[PDB]
Amino acid sequence: SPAGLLTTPVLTGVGNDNRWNGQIVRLQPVPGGFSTCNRHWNLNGSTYGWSSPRFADIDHRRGSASYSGNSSTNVLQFWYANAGSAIDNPISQVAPDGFPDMSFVPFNSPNIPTAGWVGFGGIWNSNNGAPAATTVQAYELGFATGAPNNLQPTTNTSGAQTVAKSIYAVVTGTNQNPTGLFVMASGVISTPNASATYTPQPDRIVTTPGTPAAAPVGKNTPIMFASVVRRTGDVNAAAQYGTGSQPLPVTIGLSLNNYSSALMPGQFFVWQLTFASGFMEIGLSVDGYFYAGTEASTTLIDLTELIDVRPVGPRPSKSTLVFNLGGFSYV
Amino acid sequence: SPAGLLTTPVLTGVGNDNRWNGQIVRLQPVPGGFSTCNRHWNLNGSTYGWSSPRFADIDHRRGSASYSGNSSTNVLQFWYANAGSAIDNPISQVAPDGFPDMSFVPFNSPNIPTAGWVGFGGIWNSNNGAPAATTVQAYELGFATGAPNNLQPTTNTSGAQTVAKSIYAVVTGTNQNPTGLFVMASGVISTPNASAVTYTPQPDRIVTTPGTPAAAPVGKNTPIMFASVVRRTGTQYGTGSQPLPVTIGLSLNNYSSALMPGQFFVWQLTFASGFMEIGLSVDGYFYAGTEASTTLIDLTELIDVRPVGPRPSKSTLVFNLGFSYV
């Protein structure tokens, strides 16, 4: 049984989302529907993605480094490799383990990309003991086509390129080819302007061709888990949610065991979330997507008042998940 | 039952160690014994540590940054805070969530510290929408005393300082107080030419609170660490007290009823050739019946894990083990 997968701590600070590695604080309904495969597991113990269920490092040993500058000094470093070139990755060759499943957002100095996934790391050659010191910086990472000359964002893995561009200047850029990329897997959100939205929007998510999509069933609507993720802006400048398909502990549990016997298609495994006032049910589909009986609502659900989580059991997907939330109570 | 906590995938691919977030490939016995509290959970659903059961970004906003040297550029950036100053951390104020439980290894440019814990990040001022860009670099993070003038390693939290120093030069150093440290939780091992450390951290390098329970031999049973392959800068192994999935499971539920002190929950690990028993204490430490042997057990040929149930800690855990395709 998958009942163990979700317990109160998972939604009360133990749990981090599977995309940004930020602490989960809210549930975000997605009536429009969405698709996710990276670091996302199904009840069949499988992923259509390219990443293990952890946030370690993103490494690719065979990429091409370039920069566009009149001068070598103070340029934005660029690196890219073709999707499907990550031969060192056991899970999939589409991209290096932990590479973010978001479409690349193109930008030029002195601007920073809106709603970009950003990580810390740099250019590292396989033959070298250390990364090129001059290149270590915050980098936006994304999927794109047309690198390096005509970058375009893409949400389809096939024919894509895995690209990285520093959002802040590196003291000296490099043109080395081939050369490696090393970036930490836990990301921050780059925004020039204070937005309030959530990232990524469904249109930004990159998936493989076979990836199953999440769509509303009756009054039940797919949800993403909203996390607190640090935001990075204009340098030298005085100073919101990140969303993931699954809580990481759930993702890890699904990876560990095959749950085919427990659930059948047309069924959701259900848990009840109890708040100081009221309660709601959320359901997990066979494809690993979570649902709430929120219908058309896009309002974020605050987890601050969450008191308890307990299993309900397998239930028909067609049956409306309970949504009975009444402010704030000390109870 | 805690039987569910350990399954074959945890030790054969999926499992990542709780210290480095590397992929677990082996079991390393520690005859001398050791202690660990950070990102370590017991069967009472508790930690003596300062970290959540995940690799949370290391964020401390009230630290002091400075650098030492001839000029403001190509200098090693330094940041420090007193242990017990992590007020924003709900778990403990000892250190920021995800700060490594390793004693700081002092070093001078152009050298990289031997067996240092290294993470990527930079100085970030709270009033600023971005980090000080000149400072993003790889940093050694550790517990020390004497900051910033006379750094010395320490394995005790009391009177300690949580410290960071870049192992490679920063474009331009910064002097600010207070200012934040922002470093990713997953770490890389710093290895200098020569030195040749077999695995890190060694027991004498681990930082713990005064209240942390020690892991010591019980009969022929010896406490073990989980060995993982960790990216290195400068075959070297990174070790953690627990597989993270186990740490997460322990955090999720209270297993106090399940086991009694002086008892181990036991599983049998079946290998292509031979088998062995592994036990988990109430303190959350893992044991093998290796006695004084220090052989790295290769989990590559592990084929199955099955629960045995509670057994007295004193009773010997069975140990019955070239290269085989099979």
Write the DSSP assignment of A35-76 as a string of letters.
Answer: E--TT---TTS--SSS--SS--EEEEEEEEEE---SSSEEE-
Bridge partner residues of B276 (DSSP): B269, B319
Half-sphere exposure of B245 (CA within 13 A, CB side): 31
Alpha-carbon A300 to chain mean position? 18
Q: Please tell me which of the candidates A52, A59, A121 has its beta carbon nearest to residue B120.
A: A121
Residues B86, B50 contacting (CB under 8 angstroms)? yes
- Separation in Å, CA of A186 to nearest CA in chain B: 7
Q: Which residues of B touch A255 (CB under 8 A)?
A: 9, 14
In contact, A27 and A223? CB cutoff 8 Å: yes
Q: Where are the alpha helices (DSSP H) in B1-53?
A: 8-12
Task: Tell me how far CA of residue A317 lies from CA of A27, A30, A221, A274, B71, in angstroms.
Answer: 19, 16, 10, 21, 66
Select the residue of B14, B54, B233 nearest A129 (Cβ to Cβ).
B233
Which one of A136, A234, A235 has the shortest CB-CB distance to B120?
Answer: A136
H or E stretch at A254: helix A248-256
**Does residue B72 lie within any of the structural domains?**
yes
Token readout for B159 is 């009177």
Q: Dihedrals φ, ψ of B246, to 5°?
A: -65, -45
Residues B238 and B228 sit within 8 Å (Cβ to Cβ): yes
Structure tokens at B64: 């002091």
To the nearest whole Å, the CA of B59 is away from the closest chain A CA by 10
Q: Write out chain B residues lying below 8 Å of A237, CB-based.
A: 128-130
- Tracing tokens 């192994």 back to the chain, one arrives at B237
Indicate whether A183 belongs to any domain: yes
User: Which of B10, B16, B252 shows the shortest C-beta gap to A256?
Assistant: B10
Experimental method: X-ray
Task: Kindly state whether residue A331 falls inside one of the protein's structural domains.
Answer: no
Reading the block at residue A213, the tokens are 């999509």
Q: Which amino acid is at B42?
A: N
A102 forms bridges with which residues in the sheet? A205
Chain A neighbors of B55, CB-CB under 8 A: 21, 54-56, 186
Does residue A201 form part of some domain?
yes
Contact call for residues A315 and A36 (beta carbons, < 8 A): no
- Domain assignment present for residue B326? The answer is no
For residue B210, give Cα distances in angstroms to A242, A284, B159, B160, B215: 37, 43, 11, 12, 14
Contacts of A59 in chain B (CB under 8 A): 231
* Spatial distance between the Cα atoms of A26 and A273, rounded to a whole number of angstroms: 12
Whole-number Å distance between alpha carbons of A285 and A259 = 11
Question: Which ranges of chain B would DSSP assign to H, the alpha helix?
Answer: 8-12, 244-252
Check B136 against A168: CB less than 8 A apart: yes
A-B interface: how many C-beta pairs under 8 angstroms? 134
Kindly state whether residue B19 falls inside one of the protein's structural domains.
yes
**Closest among A75, A180, A178, A61 to A134, alpha carbons compared:** A75
The structure tokens 């099979």 sit at: B326
Give the whole-angstrom CA distance, residue A15 versus residue A271.
16
**Nearest-by-Cβ selection for B128 from A185, A188, A239:** A239
Domain count for chain A, please give it.
1
Contact call for B251 and A9, based on CB within 8 A: yes
Q: Do B55 and A59 touch (CB under 8 A)?
A: no
A57 with B231: Cβ contact below 8 A: yes
Determine, yes or no, domain membership for B277. yes
Domain with A288, as residue range(s), is 1-326
Q: Locate tokens 């007290």: which residue?
A: B241
Number of H helices, E strands in chain A: 1, 23
Q: In this structure, are residues B303 and B8 in contact, taking their beta carbons and an 8 Å threshold? A: yes
Q: Is A51 part of any domain?
A: yes
